[PDB]
């Protein structure tokens, strides 16, 4: 894997239909859940990049070289069949390896994006919060809805809550 | 008092393709596909026979253009478009089979 | 000197791929359709 999407974060949120990643906060005003648009779009861009690169066709034209109606001579027929089968094997190998390799990277990059957003919030809170261990951040200055929103759009000033938080350890 | 860290950069980078993106700018890149050709047949270290006006099959039958080639030797044998296997008008049965034999004959 | 020839000349190259002549003979780079494929030899450039 990477840094655990299916690790310390135990499960995903089926209720999160607003994006691919997001925050779920809890305070004195109730329950809150909002998606993160930029990190979601980062993931979406990369996968879209893959798909559009993979979904593609040749502009190379191949013709008929044997005959379904009146069979060609055996010796040239067997060479042709032997060659075609060989190309089939190569493309069968390429195809299955391609898809397998891409799927490994797709899953891992999604892991990557989740880890990147997570450790970003961690640096965003400085010493005002502590790592829960399940992807959560226990805040030590009772953050209100406006405070939470400042964390979401990366504007949270750590040094304006620092005194209160470090006191409460 | 703080210490920062980072990486080198250039004002003018080179764009490359990745699995997931296109035209991403990297510090520097190199070409992997050769387009530069030398419009000459490089022959140093090889005994080269330019058959010129002699047809490769002619070295077997020996028409006038091929008199200098009746017993040739080469690591590299070169056919030319003006070549001709024949003086008296005619042709070879299975001519392409024979050309391929003589091509990899060494002389 | 070279070990890769075609009717138009000689391919003197260490590169793994050539886009000159599909009917090149000898010991050659693999003929490919692409005119160019840039292999990155540095990190991601992030100018100021």
């Amino acid at each position, epitope marked *: 894997l990477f840094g655990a999407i299916a690790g310390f974060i135990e499960n995903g949120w089926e209720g999160l239909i607003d*994006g691919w990643y997001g925050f779920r906060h809890q305070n004195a005003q109730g329950e809150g859940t909002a998606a993160d*648009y*930029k990190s*979601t*779009q980062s993931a*979406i861009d990369q*996968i*879209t990049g893959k*798909l*559009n*690169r993979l*979904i*593609e066709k040749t*502009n190379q034209q191949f013709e008929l070289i044997d005959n379904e109606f009146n069979e060609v001579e055996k010796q040239i027929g067997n060479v042709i069949n032997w060659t075609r089968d060989s190309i089939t094997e190569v493309w069968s190998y390429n195809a299955e390896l391609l898809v397998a390799m891409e799927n490994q990277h797709t899953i891992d990059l999604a892991d990557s994006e989740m880890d990147k957003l997570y450790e970003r919030v961690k640096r965003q809170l400085r010493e005002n919060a502590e790592e829960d261990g399940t992807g959560c951040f226990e805040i030590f200055h009772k953050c209100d809805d406006d405070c939470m929103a400042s964390i979401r759009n990366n504007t949270y000033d750590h040094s304006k809550y620092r005194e209160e938080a470090m006191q409460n350890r | 008092d703080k210490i920062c860290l980072g990486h080198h950069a250039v004002s003018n980078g080179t*764009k490359v393709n990745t699995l997931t993106e*296109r*035209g991403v700018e990297v510090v520097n890149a190199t070409e992997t596909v050769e387009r530069t050709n030398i419009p000459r047949i490089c022959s140093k270290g090889k005994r080269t026979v330019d058959l010129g006006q002699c047809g490769l099959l002619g070295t077997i039958t020996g028409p006038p253009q091929c008199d200098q080639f009746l017993e040739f030797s080469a690591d590299l044998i070169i056919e030319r478009r003006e070549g001709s296997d024949v003086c008296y008008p005619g042709k070879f049965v299975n001519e392409e089979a024979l050309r391929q034999i003589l091509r990899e004959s060494g002389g | 000197e070279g070990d890769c020839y075609h009717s138009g000349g000689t391919i003197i190259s260490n590169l793994p791929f050539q886009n000159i002549d599909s009917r090149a003979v000898g010991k050659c780079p693999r003929y490919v*359709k*692409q*005119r*160019s494929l840039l292999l990155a030899t540095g990190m991601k450039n992030v100018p100021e």
Partner: antibody, heavy 126, light 109 residues
Framework: QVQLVQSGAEVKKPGASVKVSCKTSGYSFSTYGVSWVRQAPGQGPEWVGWISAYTGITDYAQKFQGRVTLTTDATTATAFLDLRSLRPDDTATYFC???????????????????WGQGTLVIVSS | EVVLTQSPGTLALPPGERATLSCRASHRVGSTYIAWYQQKSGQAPRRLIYGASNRATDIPDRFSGSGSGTDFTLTIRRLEPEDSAVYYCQQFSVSPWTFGQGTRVEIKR
């Protein structure tokens, strides 16, 4: 029915600041975002910039970097194009076009400049 | 950047004949990131082809795009009077998203 309706034509003095709007109807907003193309009289089309209505991320061409600012609906699903320090060269027809799927993975270029606005002439002269 | 150069500058053909419009890129662009547009004097450009060969909604099947790599083609199989316009190709693989200078199509008789 998806339609892009832009603001009326405009006349500005050189060195001023213009603001073209683009009202959105038909689709949902923040599912695509907008590309802007401008066309000088008697000349071809040239791309100006793109903004996501989903993320807010903008991408400009080098020519306009620093004097163009793209923004999107206060809440009414409408995109804006803000140009300033208007040269006489900036005299052109400014088109907005709905462009590129956002909060979703989709193959192909079906949502790439698929619907355009009627246009907006910007005459920059004294 | 990627330069799209179209040819010819001007194409003049009688109605019902076959028109072939070229767009040649400086760099290899993936077929998905290429579009063709029609524009008449005064109006907004309507999208004809997207992804190099896919027809847009309600576009007549006499407009067909093809090609790959650096060479792309818009074919008008049988010209109609209302096909007299200017045609632009576009690339949006890598920014800046660039346009071709265009090809004008004119009719006859």
């Amino acid at each position: 029915q998806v339609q892009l309706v832009q603001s009326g034509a405009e006349v500005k003095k050189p060195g001023a600041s213009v603001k073209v709007s683009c009202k959105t109807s038909g689709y949902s907003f923040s599912t695509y975002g907008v590309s802007w193309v401008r066309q000088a009289p008697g000349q071809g089309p040239e791309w100006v910039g793109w903004i996501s209505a989903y993320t807010g991320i903008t991408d400009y061409a080098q020519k306009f970097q620093g004097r163009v600012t793209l923004t999107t609906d206060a809440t009414t699903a409408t995109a804006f194009l803000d140009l300033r320090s208007l040269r006489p060269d900036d005299t052109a027809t400014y088109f907005c076009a709905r462009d590129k799927v956002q909060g979703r993975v989709e193959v192909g270029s079906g949502g790439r400049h698929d619907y355009w606005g009627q246009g907006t002439l910007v005459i920059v002269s004294s | 950047e990627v330069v799209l150069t179209q040819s010819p500058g001007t194409l003049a053909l009688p109605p019902g004949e076959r028109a072939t419009l070229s767009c040649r890129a400086s760099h290899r662009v993936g077929s998905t990131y290429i579009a063709w547009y029609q524009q008449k004097s005064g109006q907004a450009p309507r999208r004809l082809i997207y992804g190099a060969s896919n027809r847009a909604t309600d576009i007549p099947d006499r407009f067909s795009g093809s090609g790959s790599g650096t060479d792309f083609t818009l074919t008008i199989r049988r010209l109609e009077p209302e096909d007299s316009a200017v045609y632009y190709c576009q690339q949006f693989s890598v920014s800046p998203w660039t346009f071709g200078q265009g090809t004008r199509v004119e009719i006859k008789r």
